[PDB]
């Protein structure tokens, strides 16, 4: 239609800027990264945003609300993703044997 | 901290079906997920392989967790060479 073609345009053309993530990663490493790191790390974070919004619209469709996304559907989105191990936290030393 | 992903993330939520005008407190949440996702995939990437940040260990975490992040990183590494072959 005429909205699906505009939505497909924003699904492809949108990206995080490489001039800021290279500034963001290098504040964590200390020295330097490469261009093929920033190209991949800018691409995984678009999949991760698409992992949340496609699942936060499943929370909103499950409850009785409309397309505008309140934060109620966004804290619930991170809760359901973390219970399936999708959201990694490297500060919780987990233990499976008890 | 200011918001470094305020205008970029509004295009992306529209790209996955949200609205043309998302709420400010919803982009407040998604901007903090991405900064933690890049932090909790760099803090764990500087212990694997070596104490640097080569991209041969960024591709390790994407398998056995979610195959969409792996099938969309093999496309960005293949298309880097088909966009330098055209020049």
């Amino acid at each position: 239609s005429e909205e699906q073609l505009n939505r497909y345009e924003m699904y492809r053309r949108s990206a995080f800027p490489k001039a800021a993530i290279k500034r963001l990663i290098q504040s964590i490493t200390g020295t330097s990264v490469s261009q093929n790191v920033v190209i991949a790390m800018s691409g995984i974070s678009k999949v991760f945003v698409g992992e949340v919004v496609e699942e936060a619209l499943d929370v909103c469709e499950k409850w009785g609300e409309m397309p505008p996304l309140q934060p109620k559907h966004m804290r619930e989105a991170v809760r359901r993703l973390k219970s399936k191990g999708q959201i990694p936290n490297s500060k919780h030393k987990k233990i499976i044997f008890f | 901290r200011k918001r470094l992903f305020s205008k970029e993330l509004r295009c992306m939520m529209y790209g996955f079906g949200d609205d043309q005008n998302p709420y400010t407190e919803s982009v407040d949440i998604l901007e903090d997920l991405v900064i933690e996702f890049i932090t909790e995939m760099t803090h764990k990437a500087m212990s694997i392989g070596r104490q640097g940040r080569v991209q041969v260990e960024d591709i390790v975490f994407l398998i056995r967790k979610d195959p969409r992040k792996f099938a969309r990183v093999k496309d960005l590494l293949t298309m880097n060479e088909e966009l330098k072959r055209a020049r």
Partner: peptide, 26 residues
Amino acid sequence: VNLSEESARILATNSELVGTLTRSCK
């Protein structure tokens, strides 16, 4: 020179269509 000016035109239309009014929520 063609790659330098056309890169910012994919993002310039990404500030005219999406996000016209800024909302909030209780």
